[PDB]
Coordinates of C-alpha atoms and ligand atoms in Angstrom, one line a residue:
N4 CA 0.0 0.0 0.0
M5 CA 2.7 2.5 -1.0
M6 CA -0.1 4.6 -2.6
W7 CA -2.1 5.2 0.5
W8 CA -1.3 8.9 0.2
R9 CA -3.1 9.2 -3.1
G10 CA -6.6 9.7 -1.9
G11 CA -5.8 9.3 1.8
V12 CA -7.5 11.5 4.5
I13 CA -5.0 13.3 6.8
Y14 CA -5.9 14.9 10.1
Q15 CA -4.0 18.2 10.8
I16 CA -2.9 18.7 14.3
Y17 CA -1.8 22.1 15.6
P18 CA 0.3 20.9 18.5
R19 CA 0.0 24.1 20.6
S20 CA -3.7 23.8 20.8
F21 CA -4.4 20.1 20.9
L22 CA -3.8 18.9 24.5
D23 CA -1.6 20.2 27.3
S24 CA -0.4 17.2 29.3
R25 CA 2.1 19.0 31.5
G26 CA 0.2 22.0 32.8
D27 CA 1.8 25.1 31.2
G28 CA -1.3 26.0 29.1
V29 CA 0.4 25.0 25.8
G30 CA -0.3 21.8 24.0
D31 CA 2.5 19.2 23.8
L32 CA 3.5 16.0 22.0
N33 CA 2.5 13.7 24.9
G34 CA -1.0 15.1 24.8
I35 CA -1.2 14.1 21.2
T36 CA 0.1 10.7 22.1
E37 CA -2.6 10.5 24.7
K38 CA -5.3 11.3 22.1
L39 CA -4.2 9.2 19.2
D40 CA -7.0 6.7 20.0
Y41 CA -9.5 9.5 19.4
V42 CA -7.7 10.5 16.2
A43 CA -7.7 6.9 14.9
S44 CA -11.4 6.7 15.9
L45 CA -12.1 9.4 13.3
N46 CA -11.3 6.8 10.6
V47 CA -8.6 9.0 9.1
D48 CA -5.5 7.5 7.6
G49 CA -3.0 9.7 9.4
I50 CA -1.9 13.0 10.7
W51 CA 0.0 16.1 9.8
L52 CA 1.7 17.9 12.7
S53 CA 2.3 21.6 12.5
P54 CA 5.8 22.6 13.5
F55 CA 7.1 21.4 16.9
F56 CA 10.7 22.0 16.3
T57 CA 13.1 24.3 18.2
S58 CA 11.8 27.8 17.7
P59 CA 11.5 31.3 19.3
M60 CA 7.8 30.9 18.4
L61 CA 7.5 34.3 16.8
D62 CA 5.5 32.7 14.1
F63 CA 4.5 29.9 16.4
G64 CA 6.8 27.2 15.1
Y65 CA 7.2 28.4 11.6
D66 CA 10.4 30.2 12.6
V67 CA 12.7 27.3 13.1
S68 CA 16.0 27.6 14.9
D69 CA 16.9 23.9 15.0
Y70 CA 15.5 21.6 12.3
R71 CA 16.5 18.3 14.0
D72 CA 15.1 18.8 17.5
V73 CA 11.9 19.3 19.4
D74 CA 11.4 22.6 21.2
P75 CA 11.4 22.2 25.0
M76 CA 7.9 23.6 25.1
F77 CA 6.6 20.6 23.1
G78 CA 8.6 18.0 24.9
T79 CA 11.6 16.0 23.6
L80 CA 12.7 13.9 20.6
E81 CA 12.0 10.8 22.7
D82 CA 8.4 12.1 23.2
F83 CA 8.2 12.3 19.4
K84 CA 9.5 8.8 18.8
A85 CA 6.9 7.5 21.3
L86 CA 4.2 9.5 19.4
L87 CA 5.3 8.1 16.1
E88 CA 5.5 4.5 17.3
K89 CA 2.1 4.6 19.0
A90 CA 0.6 6.2 15.9
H91 CA 2.0 3.4 13.7
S92 CA 0.6 0.8 16.2
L93 CA -2.9 2.3 15.5
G94 CA -2.4 2.1 11.7
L95 CA -1.9 5.9 11.4
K96 CA 0.6 7.5 9.1
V97 CA 2.5 10.4 10.6
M98 CA 3.5 13.4 8.5
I99 CA 5.2 16.6 9.9
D100 CA 5.7 20.1 8.7
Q101 CA 9.0 21.0 7.1
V102 CA 9.8 24.7 6.9
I103 CA 12.8 25.0 4.6
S104 CA 11.9 28.2 2.7
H105 CA 13.2 30.3 5.6
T106 CA 14.8 29.9 9.1
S107 CA 14.4 31.8 12.3
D108 CA 16.9 34.7 12.6
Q109 CA 18.0 32.7 15.7
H110 CA 19.1 29.8 13.5
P111 CA 22.9 29.3 13.6
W112 CA 23.1 29.6 9.8
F113 CA 21.6 33.1 9.8
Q114 CA 23.6 34.2 12.9
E115 CA 26.7 33.3 10.9
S116 CA 25.5 34.6 7.5
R117 CA 24.7 38.1 8.8
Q118 CA 28.1 38.8 10.4
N119 CA 29.7 40.0 7.1
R120 CA 29.7 39.5 3.4
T121 CA 32.5 36.9 3.1
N122 CA 31.8 34.2 5.8
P123 CA 31.0 30.7 4.6
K124 CA 27.3 31.2 4.9
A125 CA 27.2 34.7 3.5
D126 CA 25.2 33.6 0.4
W127 CA 23.0 31.0 2.2
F128 CA 20.5 33.8 2.6
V129 CA 19.2 36.5 0.3
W130 CA 21.3 39.7 0.7
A131 CA 21.4 42.7 -1.5
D132 CA 22.8 46.3 -1.4
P133 CA 20.4 49.2 -0.8
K134 CA 19.5 51.4 -3.8
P135 CA 21.7 54.5 -4.0
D136 CA 19.2 56.4 -1.8
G137 CA 19.5 53.7 0.9
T138 CA 16.1 52.1 0.2
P139 CA 15.1 48.4 -0.3
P140 CA 16.4 46.7 -3.5
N141 CA 13.0 46.3 -5.0
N142 CA 9.2 46.5 -4.4
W143 CA 8.6 43.1 -2.8
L144 CA 6.4 43.2 0.3
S145 CA 6.3 41.0 3.3
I146 CA 3.0 39.1 3.7
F147 CA 3.2 40.0 7.4
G148 CA 3.6 43.7 6.7
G149 CA 6.0 46.2 5.3
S150 CA 8.9 45.6 2.8
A151 CA 10.2 42.1 2.2
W152 CA 13.6 43.5 2.9
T153 CA 15.2 44.4 6.2
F154 CA 18.4 46.4 6.7
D155 CA 21.2 44.9 8.7
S156 CA 24.0 47.2 9.8
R157 CA 26.6 44.5 10.0
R158 CA 26.7 43.9 6.3
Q159 CA 25.2 47.3 5.2
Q160 CA 22.8 45.2 3.1
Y161 CA 19.2 44.2 3.1
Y162 CA 18.1 40.6 3.7
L163 CA 14.9 39.1 2.2
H164 CA 12.0 37.8 4.2
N165 CA 8.6 37.0 2.7
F166 CA 7.3 36.6 6.2
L167 CA 8.4 38.0 9.5
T168 CA 11.7 40.0 9.8
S169 CA 12.7 37.1 12.0
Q170 CA 12.2 34.6 9.2
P171 CA 15.0 35.3 6.7
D172 CA 14.5 33.4 3.4
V173 CA 17.1 30.8 2.4
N174 CA 18.8 31.4 -0.9
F175 CA 18.0 28.2 -2.9
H176 CA 20.3 29.4 -5.6
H177 CA 23.1 28.1 -3.4
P178 CA 23.3 24.4 -4.0
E179 CA 24.9 23.7 -0.6
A180 CA 22.0 25.4 1.3
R181 CA 19.6 23.3 -0.8
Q182 CA 21.4 20.1 0.0
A183 CA 21.5 21.1 3.7
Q184 CA 17.7 21.4 3.7
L185 CA 17.4 18.0 2.0
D186 CA 19.7 16.6 4.8
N187 CA 17.5 18.2 7.4
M188 CA 14.5 16.4 5.9
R189 CA 16.4 13.1 5.6
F190 CA 16.9 13.3 9.4
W191 CA 13.2 12.9 9.9
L192 CA 12.8 10.3 7.2
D193 CA 15.5 8.2 9.0
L194 CA 13.3 8.3 12.2
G195 CA 10.5 6.7 10.1
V196 CA 8.1 9.6 9.5
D197 CA 5.7 8.8 6.6
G198 CA 6.0 12.2 5.0
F199 CA 5.9 16.0 5.0
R200 CA 3.6 18.9 4.6
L201 CA 5.9 21.4 2.7
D202 CA 5.3 24.9 4.0
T203 CA 5.2 27.7 1.3
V204 CA 6.5 25.1 -1.2
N205 CA 6.5 27.5 -4.2
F206 CA 8.4 30.2 -2.3
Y207 CA 11.8 28.3 -2.3
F208 CA 13.3 30.2 -5.3
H209 CA 13.2 33.9 -5.9
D210 CA 14.4 35.8 -9.0
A211 CA 18.1 36.5 -8.7
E212 CA 17.8 39.6 -10.9
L213 CA 15.5 41.0 -8.1
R214 CA 12.9 42.4 -10.6
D215 CA 10.0 44.5 -9.4
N216 CA 6.6 42.8 -9.5
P217 CA 3.9 44.4 -11.6
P218 CA 0.8 45.9 -10.0
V219 CA -2.6 44.2 -10.0
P220 CA -4.7 46.2 -12.5
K221 CA -7.7 47.8 -10.9
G222 CA -10.8 45.5 -10.7
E223 CA -8.9 42.3 -11.2
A224 CA -9.2 39.5 -8.6
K225 CA -6.7 39.5 -5.8
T226 CA -4.8 36.4 -4.6
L227 CA -6.7 33.9 -2.5
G228 CA -3.8 33.5 -0.1
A229 CA -4.2 36.9 1.7
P230 CA -6.9 39.2 3.0
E231 CA -7.8 42.1 0.6
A232 CA -6.8 44.7 3.2
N233 CA -3.2 43.5 2.9
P234 CA -1.1 45.6 0.5
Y235 CA 0.7 42.4 -0.5
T236 CA -2.4 41.9 -2.7
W237 CA -1.6 45.0 -4.8
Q238 CA 1.1 43.3 -6.9
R239 CA 1.2 40.2 -9.1
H240 CA 3.7 37.8 -7.6
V241 CA 6.0 36.8 -10.4
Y242 CA 9.5 37.4 -9.3
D243 CA 9.4 37.0 -5.6
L244 CA 8.3 33.3 -5.9
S245 CA 7.3 30.4 -8.1
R246 CA 10.5 30.4 -10.2
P247 CA 11.2 27.8 -12.8
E248 CA 14.4 26.6 -11.0
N249 CA 12.1 25.2 -8.2
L250 CA 11.0 22.4 -10.6
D251 CA 14.5 21.0 -10.7
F252 CA 14.8 21.2 -6.9
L253 CA 11.4 19.5 -6.5
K254 CA 12.9 16.6 -8.4
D255 CA 15.8 16.4 -6.0
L256 CA 13.4 16.5 -3.1
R257 CA 11.3 13.8 -4.7
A258 CA 14.5 11.7 -5.2
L259 CA 15.1 11.9 -1.5
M260 CA 11.5 10.8 -0.8
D261 CA 11.9 7.9 -3.1
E262 CA 14.7 6.4 -1.0
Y263 CA 12.0 5.8 1.7
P264 CA 9.3 3.8 -0.1
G265 CA 5.8 4.7 1.0
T266 CA 6.6 8.3 2.1
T267 CA 4.7 11.3 0.7
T268 CA 4.7 15.0 0.4
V269 CA 1.9 17.6 0.4
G270 CA 3.0 21.1 -0.7
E271 CA 1.3 24.3 0.4
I272 CA 0.7 26.4 -2.6
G273 CA 0.5 30.2 -2.3
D274 CA 0.4 31.7 -5.8
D275 CA -1.6 34.0 -8.1
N276 CA -2.8 31.0 -10.1
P277 CA -2.7 28.2 -7.4
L278 CA -4.6 25.4 -9.3
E279 CA -2.2 25.7 -12.2
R280 CA 0.8 25.8 -9.9
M281 CA -0.5 22.7 -8.0
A282 CA -1.0 20.8 -11.3
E283 CA 2.5 21.9 -12.3
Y284 CA 4.2 20.8 -9.1
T285 CA 2.4 17.5 -8.7
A286 CA 2.7 16.3 -12.3
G287 CA 5.3 14.0 -13.9
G288 CA 5.5 11.6 -10.9
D289 CA 8.9 13.0 -10.3
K290 CA 8.0 16.0 -8.1
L291 CA 5.4 16.5 -5.4
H292 CA 3.0 13.7 -4.6
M293 CA 0.2 16.2 -3.8
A294 CA -0.5 19.8 -2.9
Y295 CA -3.3 22.0 -1.6
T296 CA -4.4 25.5 -2.6
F297 CA -6.5 28.2 -1.1
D298 CA -9.3 27.7 -3.6
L299 CA -11.4 26.0 -1.0
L300 CA -10.0 28.0 1.9
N301 CA -11.6 31.3 1.0
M302 CA -15.1 32.9 0.9
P303 CA -16.8 31.4 -2.2
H304 CA -18.5 28.1 -1.4
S305 CA -21.6 27.8 -3.6
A306 CA -22.3 24.6 -5.6
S307 CA -21.6 26.6 -8.8
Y308 CA -18.3 27.8 -7.4
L309 CA -17.3 24.2 -6.6
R310 CA -18.3 23.3 -10.1
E311 CA -16.0 26.0 -11.5
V312 CA -13.1 24.7 -9.3
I313 CA -13.7 21.2 -10.5
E314 CA -13.9 22.1 -14.2
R315 CA -10.8 24.4 -14.0
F316 CA -8.9 21.6 -12.3
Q317 CA -10.1 19.1 -14.9
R318 CA -8.6 21.1 -17.7
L319 CA -5.2 20.9 -16.1
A320 CA -2.5 18.1 -16.3
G321 CA -4.2 14.7 -16.0
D322 CA -1.3 13.3 -13.9
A323 CA -1.6 16.0 -11.2
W324 CA -3.0 15.1 -7.7
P325 CA -4.7 17.5 -5.5
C326 CA -5.1 17.5 -1.7
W327 CA -8.3 19.2 -0.6
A328 CA -8.8 21.2 2.6
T329 CA -11.7 23.4 3.8
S330 CA -9.8 24.5 7.0
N331 CA -6.3 24.8 8.4
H332 CA -4.3 26.9 11.0
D333 CA -4.2 29.9 8.6
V334 CA -7.9 30.5 7.9
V335 CA -11.3 31.1 9.5
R336 CA -12.8 27.8 10.5
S337 CA -15.0 26.4 7.7
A338 CA -18.2 26.2 9.7
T339 CA -18.0 30.0 10.0
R340 CA -16.1 31.0 6.9
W341 CA -18.4 29.1 4.6
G342 CA -21.4 28.3 6.9
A343 CA -22.0 31.5 8.9
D344 CA -25.3 32.1 7.2
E345 CA -26.2 28.4 7.3
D346 CA -27.5 26.0 10.0
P347 CA -24.6 25.5 12.4
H348 CA -25.4 21.9 13.0
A349 CA -26.5 20.6 9.6
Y350 CA -24.3 22.6 7.2
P351 CA -20.9 21.3 8.4
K352 CA -22.2 17.8 7.8
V353 CA -23.0 18.2 4.2
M354 CA -20.0 20.4 3.6
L355 CA -17.7 17.6 4.9
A356 CA -19.6 15.2 2.7
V357 CA -18.6 17.2 -0.3
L358 CA -15.0 17.5 0.9
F359 CA -14.8 13.7 1.4
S360 CA -16.4 13.0 -2.0
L361 CA -14.1 15.1 -4.1
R362 CA -11.4 13.5 -6.3
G363 CA -8.2 13.9 -4.4
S364 CA -6.6 13.4 -1.0
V365 CA -8.1 15.4 1.9
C366 CA -6.8 17.4 4.8
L367 CA -9.2 17.6 7.8
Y368 CA -8.3 20.2 10.5
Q369 CA -8.6 19.5 14.2
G370 CA -12.1 20.5 15.4
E371 CA -13.5 20.7 11.9
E372 CA -15.0 17.2 12.7
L373 CA -16.8 18.9 15.6
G374 CA -18.4 21.7 13.5
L375 CA -16.4 24.2 15.5
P376 CA -17.2 27.9 14.7
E377 CA -14.5 30.4 14.5
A378 CA -13.5 31.6 18.0
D379 CA -13.5 35.2 19.0
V380 CA -10.2 36.2 20.5
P381 CA -10.2 39.6 22.3
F382 CA -7.5 42.1 21.4
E383 CA -5.7 41.8 24.7
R384 CA -5.4 38.0 24.1
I385 CA -4.1 38.2 20.5
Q386 CA -0.9 36.2 19.9
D387 CA -0.4 35.9 16.1
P388 CA 1.9 38.7 14.9
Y389 CA -0.2 38.6 11.7
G390 CA -3.1 39.8 13.9
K391 CA -1.4 43.0 15.0
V392 CA -0.6 44.6 11.7
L393 CA -3.9 45.1 9.9
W394 CA -6.2 45.2 12.9
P395 CA -9.2 45.5 12.8
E396 CA -9.8 44.9 9.1
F397 CA -7.9 41.7 9.5
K398 CA -7.4 40.1 12.9
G399 CA -4.9 37.4 12.2
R400 CA -5.3 33.6 12.7
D401 CA -5.8 33.1 16.4
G402 CA -9.5 32.5 15.9
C403 CA -8.8 29.1 14.4
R404 CA -6.0 28.3 16.8
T405 CA -7.9 28.3 20.1
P406 CA -7.6 25.1 22.2
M407 CA -9.4 21.9 21.4
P408 CA -12.5 21.3 23.5
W409 CA -12.2 17.8 25.0
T410 CA -14.9 18.1 27.7
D411 CA -17.5 20.7 28.7
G412 CA -15.7 21.3 31.9
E413 CA -13.0 23.9 32.9
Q414 CA -10.9 24.9 29.9
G415 CA -12.7 22.2 28.0
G416 CA -10.4 19.8 29.7
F417 CA -7.6 21.2 27.6
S418 CA -5.4 22.4 30.4
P419 CA -5.3 22.7 34.3
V420 CA -4.2 26.3 33.9
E421 CA -5.2 29.2 31.6
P422 CA -4.2 28.2 28.1
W423 CA -2.1 30.2 25.7
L424 CA -5.3 31.2 23.9
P425 CA -8.7 31.4 25.6
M426 CA -11.0 28.4 25.3
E427 CA -14.0 29.5 23.3
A428 CA -17.2 29.4 25.3
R429 CA -19.3 28.2 22.3
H430 CA -16.9 25.2 21.9
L431 CA -17.7 23.6 25.3
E432 CA -21.2 22.2 24.3
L433 CA -19.5 21.0 21.1
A434 CA -16.7 19.3 23.0
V435 CA -15.5 15.7 22.2
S436 CA -17.1 14.3 25.4
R437 CA -20.5 15.9 24.5
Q438 CA -20.3 14.7 21.0
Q439 CA -18.8 11.3 21.4
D440 CA -21.9 9.1 21.8
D441 CA -24.3 11.3 20.0
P442 CA -25.0 9.6 16.7
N443 CA -26.6 12.9 15.6
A444 CA -23.5 15.0 16.4
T445 CA -21.1 16.1 13.6
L446 CA -18.3 13.9 15.0
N447 CA -20.2 10.8 14.3
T448 CA -21.4 12.0 10.9
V449 CA -17.7 12.3 10.1
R450 CA -16.8 8.9 11.5
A451 CA -19.7 7.5 9.4
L452 CA -18.7 9.3 6.2
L453 CA -15.0 8.2 6.4
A454 CA -16.0 4.6 7.0
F455 CA -18.4 4.8 4.0
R456 CA -15.7 6.5 1.9
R457 CA -13.3 3.8 3.0
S458 CA -15.7 1.1 1.8
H459 CA -15.9 2.3 -1.8
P460 CA -13.0 2.1 -4.1
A461 CA -14.5 4.8 -6.3
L462 CA -14.3 7.3 -3.4
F463 CA -10.6 6.6 -2.8
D464 CA -9.1 7.6 -6.2
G465 CA -11.9 7.1 -8.7
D466 CA -12.4 9.5 -11.7
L467 CA -14.9 12.3 -11.2
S468 CA -17.4 13.4 -13.8
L469 CA -19.7 16.4 -13.2
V470 CA -23.4 15.8 -14.0
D471 CA -26.3 18.1 -14.5
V472 CA -28.4 18.3 -11.3
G473 CA -29.6 21.9 -11.5
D474 CA -28.2 25.2 -10.3
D475 CA -28.5 24.8 -6.6
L476 CA -27.2 21.2 -6.1
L477 CA -23.8 19.8 -6.7
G478 CA -23.5 16.5 -8.5
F479 CA -21.0 14.2 -9.9
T480 CA -20.2 10.5 -10.4
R481 CA -17.1 8.8 -9.1
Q482 CA -15.9 5.7 -11.0
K483 CA -13.5 2.9 -10.5
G484 CA -13.8 -0.6 -12.1
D485 CA -17.2 -2.3 -11.3
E486 CA -18.2 0.7 -9.2
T487 CA -19.7 4.0 -10.3
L488 CA -21.4 6.1 -7.7
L489 CA -23.6 9.1 -8.0
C490 CA -22.9 11.8 -5.4
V491 CA -25.4 14.7 -5.0
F492 CA -25.2 17.4 -2.3
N493 CA -27.6 20.1 -1.1
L494 CA -25.5 22.8 0.4
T495 CA -28.6 25.1 0.8
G496 CA -31.1 25.5 3.6
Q497 CA -34.0 24.9 1.3
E498 CA -35.4 21.6 -0.2
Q499 CA -34.1 21.1 -3.7
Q500 CA -35.1 18.7 -6.4
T501 CA -33.7 17.3 -9.7
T502 CA -34.0 14.7 -12.5
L503 CA -31.4 12.1 -12.1
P504 CA -28.9 12.3 -15.0
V505 CA -27.9 8.7 -14.6
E506 CA -29.7 5.4 -13.8
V507 CA -29.7 4.3 -10.2
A508 CA -29.1 0.7 -9.3
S509 CA -29.5 1.3 -5.6
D510 CA -29.5 3.8 -2.8
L511 CA -26.5 4.0 -0.5
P512 CA -27.5 5.0 3.1
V513 CA -24.9 6.9 5.1
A514 CA -24.8 8.9 8.3
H515 CA -28.5 9.6 8.7
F516 CA -28.7 11.6 5.5
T517 CA -32.3 11.6 4.2
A518 CA -33.2 11.9 0.5
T519 CA -36.3 10.9 -1.5
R520 CA -35.9 9.1 -4.7
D521 CA -39.2 8.8 -6.6
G522 CA -38.7 7.3 -10.0
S523 CA -36.4 9.7 -11.9
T524 CA -36.9 12.6 -9.5
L525 CA -34.5 13.0 -6.5
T526 CA -35.5 15.3 -3.7
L527 CA -33.0 16.6 -1.1
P528 CA -34.2 18.3 2.1
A529 CA -32.0 21.1 3.5
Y530 CA -28.3 20.2 3.9
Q531 CA -28.7 16.6 2.8
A532 CA -26.4 14.5 0.8
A533 CA -27.3 11.5 -1.4
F534 CA -25.2 8.7 -2.6
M535 CA -26.4 6.1 -5.2
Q536 CA -25.0 3.1 -6.9
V537 CA -25.2 3.5 -10.7
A538 CA -26.0 0.6 -13.0
Ligands
PRU1 C1 5.6 30.3 7.5 C2 4.1 30.1 7.4 C3 3.7 30.2 5.9 C4 2.6 29.4 5.4 C5 1.9 30.1 4.2 C6 1.4 31.6 4.3 C7 1.4 32.0 2.9 C8 0.3 33.0 2.5 C9 -0.5 32.6 1.2 O1 -1.4 31.7 1.3 O2 -0.2 33.2 0.1 C10 0.1 31.7 5.0 O3 -0.4 32.9 5.4 O4 -0.7 30.7 5.2 C11 1.6 28.9 6.4 O5 1.0 29.8 7.1 O6 1.3 27.7 6.6 C12 3.3 31.2 8.1 O7 2.8 32.1 7.4 O8 3.1 31.2 9.3
MG2 MG1 2.1 21.6 27.8

């Protein structure tokens, strides 16, 4: 089963906010180990851990100061080996973040690099002289605010950072820096991890000529990877990322992965044309195994929008392989972002049915299986630096990073002390303990859906074909071998009805969904899904 990743369902864990087992208010590895039984009980195939490596935590793990160790705050390397082994014993794959596009400015490489222009690591990062007036070398902007260039008096030069000033970008034009990052990944492969989520995977290379980006012409759509209030959205991102050289490197990265049969990679795409980039990066069988985009992580969510996404993707490279996600640690929780104006109990159910029925792998975010709404974090409790630069038009990412509600008791059973972000009051009645034995709760709908999906080869990696089912329903068939299934979804809060475009052999009952099939007319009550075996 060395192709489990190609259609597999991955559960994303944000270690800080999963379970505190030690009592400091921050989630740790041992807490995860303690909850792997729950995770396995979701019927997912594995997990992806957000960064737990040595880090100042200025971007909460994504500023790495030691690639081959666990930060004391999360536990130890031994804790991780225990987690990994227990996870394997439960049949779970374990993937971890790898953040190789940039290091913390506390990383020894950068400490060395910044001292002068001639040291051995001077070119391991991206340095450039000021313009004659002393200003940044070009017009590139940090996603987290201000210029992508920061002046350093030691070298009398600017260094590049797409993200925080404390996250200097690695210069992939330097083959030794590239190889060093491969070696860092190899370290975790040798411990037996099953794969990597590759942070900002298309950011690796920048244009060495340092060309200015062009502006976005007035009225044109902005990138899906950033809020519209961010001036980063005012330029087309052509030279600051997604360079051709990255393809060669992705091959190298893939070669590394191939030395460890059965391992996989999911790349994070942040690009002006993300579907295209994802097809580009996952094609050929010699680069990334899969990647996800922000196409399903934004505001549009109608059945017609989903149709547009599917069509667009279907026109791309036939050998590409997408990983789909409706939530992660960077966006408003789906039940709010997509379902704010929908029934809070029924909408997440059908939305997840769609997610689990699309052709691709799936990433499912911690708490999404509980139908958790976005949390409201008060100003004085804000932690994410990305929540302190565009406030209040954009309030950062803490709203999706609040601690996991295990019980309806104090701190949701997450911690014995006040946690690093406040437990959301609305989450308590949606806690795991409250939801565990309720067959009508979103948790059990998810368990049921993933068991169902697991029982049908066509829902693993079958082809997908859109079918006419009217304007307000989403419909397609999934096909593999003997099996062709018809999948129809009502994402609206009103009854909808359609003529079946194919001929139904039988109904497939799943997770208490209710739909009326009368001859050739299919009726779906609000927020219902319907699966049918096709003749
Ligand atoms: C280093 C890490 C970057 C990526 C990607 C980033 C890129 C923005 C984009 O989607 O274009 C983000 O805001 O999500 C991540 O968050 O997972 C971070 O921003 O904290
Ligand atoms: Mg802890």
